[PDB]
Amino acid sequence: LTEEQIAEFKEAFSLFDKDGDGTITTKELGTVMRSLGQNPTEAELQDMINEVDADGNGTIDFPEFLTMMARKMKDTDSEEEIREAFRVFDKDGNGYISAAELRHVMTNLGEKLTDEEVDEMIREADIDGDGQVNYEEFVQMMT
């Protein structure tokens, strides 16, 4: 597991850990999933942590989160999580994530970013140079 990959997972960990105490509770899992239009039950949230929870204190610290990401979670029906996630970013559904939509998703996830920073994020994912991120560029970015 590479340096950049542990830094990306550390970044994903920080967005679920809303109070910043180093553990992700079922409550933070629920609150982040509901803010992205999902509605998990208490039993589904408890199984999600029980799968990852190696030391048994009921929460997920960053070592456990790291183990989860390495031996990745399996698909039941949703094999293309890339398209599902792409639809969360592409708010108006036209097939292209603009800087405005990306800025909107970062604010919903709880972070204030400069317009230059959002513009640099678009520039990282943009392969053809049109100033936006389509689906094929979103996939390449993750694969």
Binding site: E4, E11, V32, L36, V88, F89, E120, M121, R123, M141
Partner: peptide, 18 residues
């Protein structure tokens, strides 16, 4: 600021959340 890691971190968070 690392743009690629902030971006891929946020895409990873939505992937897991959905």
């Amino acid at each position: 600021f690392n743009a690629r890691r902030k971006l891929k971190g946020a895409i990873l968070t939505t992937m897991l959340a959905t």
